[PDB]
Amino acid sequence: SGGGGGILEKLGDICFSLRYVPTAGKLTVVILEAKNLKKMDVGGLSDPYVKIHLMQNGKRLKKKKTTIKKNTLNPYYNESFSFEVPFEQIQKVQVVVTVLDYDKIGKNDAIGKVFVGYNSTGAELRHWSDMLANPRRPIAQWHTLQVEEEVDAMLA
Ligand SMILES: [Ca+2]
Ligand SMILES: [Ca+2]
């Protein structure tokens, strides 16, 4: 129950898999696809890419990013990323997933973001809990993107 703050924001959705291997402390995130993204270019669509942050206690510990897909609101990525998180800390971290529009000049604006892990709620918490309940098993799930203002207030 609960969560769902981004549902009516109409920013789009992201699908990714999570896998956690406790013995090795290996956390794998595969960015699969996004859909229904907000348009971010005047006269056009968006040039989306995805950033992943590992966080704890308001600090960005590690940063990864996908390739950029041009001129689409429904990008497919299928790009894998791994992090090292010891089992004693896996219930105390966040994985933050942000979709942004690439612009050749100017700060790349976020479309929206979500996080899973500590302090996550709703479908975000469910995905994380499913990951932890099933060591070594990759679990794919869709998430609704939420405005950065809101998500960042929860992460800070
Ligand atoms: Ca733009
Ligand atoms: Ca752009």
Is 13 annotated to bind a ligand? Reply is no
Resolution (A): 1.0
Technique behind the model? X-ray
What are the residues facing 81 on neighbouring strands? 29
* Closest among 8, 12, 10, 14 to 124, alpha carbons compared: 14
**Tokens linked to 47:** 């040039």
Helix (H) or strand (E) holding 52: strand 48-56
Q: How deeply is 59 buried, as exposed, middle or buried, from its count of CB atoms within 10 A (0-12, 13-18, 19+)?
A: exposed
The rounded distance, in Å, linking the Cα atoms of 64 and 80 is 10
**Tokens linked to 105:** 């000049």
Rounded to the nearest whole angstrom, what is the distance from the C-alpha of residue 88 to the centroid of ligand 2? 40
What are the residues facing 65 on neighbouring strands? 51
Rounded to the nearest whole angstrom, what is the distance from the C-alpha of residue 81 to the centroid of ligand 2? 24
Could you say which architecture CATH assigns to the domain 1-156? Sandwich (2.60)
Task: Say whether 104 sits in a helix, a strand or coil.
Answer: coil
Beta strand pairing call for 59-65 and 110-117: unpaired
Is 152 annotated to bind a ligand? Reply is no
